[model samples]
Target: MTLPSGHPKSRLIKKFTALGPYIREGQCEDNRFFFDCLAVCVNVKPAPEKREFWGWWMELEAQEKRFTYRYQFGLFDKEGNWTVVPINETEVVERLEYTLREFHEKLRDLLISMELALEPSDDFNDEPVKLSA
Candidate 1:
């Protein structure tokens, strides 16, 4: 179905909306869309009669020189070390949407491996893939 102009699912809204549910809904098991970082980020475990929830630490940088955004996906797994996932892996449009920070490259790579961004987006669509046909 074609979306009406300015609909929540239209263009930018669609992209961000797809990425929103995870960060907002907190966490749950057997949820598909929760497969991303937030799945690993926000965690709740029961110890005795108590419960614990750990939300990933988020840091945003839009500063003097380099503007960047980042989030630590999950905290120390079974090991003592913590895990991290970036926001870019699921965000950013290829056709050069306001110049995604360079730091986003590595996260973008991981996202690609996960079947998110199949191919990197460029500043412009020189040879666009036919999503319609």
Candidate 2:
């Protein structure tokens, strides 16, 4: 799909919509799309009574500076450890779209790992709920 012409601010929305299938629905403070896969983020306990939902957090920022744009992704893990990735923004729509796709591809494995670490044992019936594709 081609990006419609407008202020550069709208480009993230257009590309994000293209990536809709990979993330859950949400909105940012600026009314743009904010998304993440929460299934793996939720706690999966061996026993329902013992379950603990540690929660998850993430944020993205696109800032314009002088002649450059900076893109940042930040979040804290379940253990409260901060993880951040700050990137030099790719202004071209095509390149920005490709970069986000690549980021999601790398994130898939991370999500799967989170599931495995959070719930090491299969649930009662002996069937583990797998989170990866």
Candidate 3:
């Protein structure tokens, strides 16, 4: 069954919004804009070795993004990965991903189609584009 946004089970939009800050901060050069089922991060870089590095970095950054969260999750680093933090769980992550992609993609396309985005030559992503909070 499809879940509504902000429902207890809904995950990905939270993930998208959760990770938005980090991605904007340049923590993730290539991100999983697609709603990955497991809330996983993968590197599209040609090098496989770099995948783990970037993946882990994204993972940690993802946790860091949820700053207000007292105990969201831990990295697979020094302390260790903490299972089952306060946010949504893996069982619903796939749905979260699908919905998140649709939400983000549609928003982007809507803007682009409306000529809200700058021309190709302008190519400036820095221009402020605030999503409805």
Candidate 4:
């Protein structure tokens, strides 16, 4: 049930990996593919000095006909706690949004360039708006 490196969806995974240095591709325990972005740091003077990071991960599935994914962004602290609230910081949130948008655009273009069909198709209208006379 795992996707091999030569799978067509591997192109999607590779595209994600090329998005940025922090982005990485991995497999979940269920053998599904996933991508993540991590930024780690060591906190000193907190008495016990601890390691922590802010990151995000998304699990991807490629059905026989379409692609699907789920994602979450958060912070992981030394205590093994994961909190999404910290990721609400404006800058972090903005960056994550931008990255997701980039992926969406790339995916759309890839599907078209690869001549793959998408169920339900895209609803975007490129026609200019017509005003009532």
- What's the true lDDT of residue 4 in model 2? 22
lDDT of 4 by residue, 1-133 (tens): 2354335545665654544543334544554654445543334455433556566655455556555555455665555444554554455555666665565566566656555554421333453222221
Please list the Cα RMSD from the true structure of every candidate, rounded to 1 decimal place.
15.7, 17.7, 16.2, 8.4
Error of 4 at 79 (Å): 12
Could you arrange the candidates by TM-score from highest to lowest?
4, 2, 3, 1
Q: For candidate 3, give the lDDT.
A: 0.30
Expressed as tens digits, the lDDT of each residue in 1-133 for candidate 1 is 2222212223322343344333323333422112222222222354522422223433332223222344233332333234543333232222222222332554455334434423333333575433233
Which has the better lDDT: candidate 1, or candidate 2?
Answer: 2
Cα lDDT of model 3 by residue, 1-133, tens digit: 2122222223443434553432222233442222212334333455543332111112211111121111112222223233333333454344443544354454445334434332221233564222222
Residue-level lDDT tens digits of model 2 in 76-110: 24443445433232332334344444654544454
Candidate achieving the largest TM-score: 4
Q: What is the lDDT of residue 83 in candidate 1?
A: 54
Question: Higher-lDDT candidate among 2 and 4?
Answer: 4
2 or 4, greater by TM-score: 4
Compute the lDDT of residue 124 as modeled in candidate 2: 29
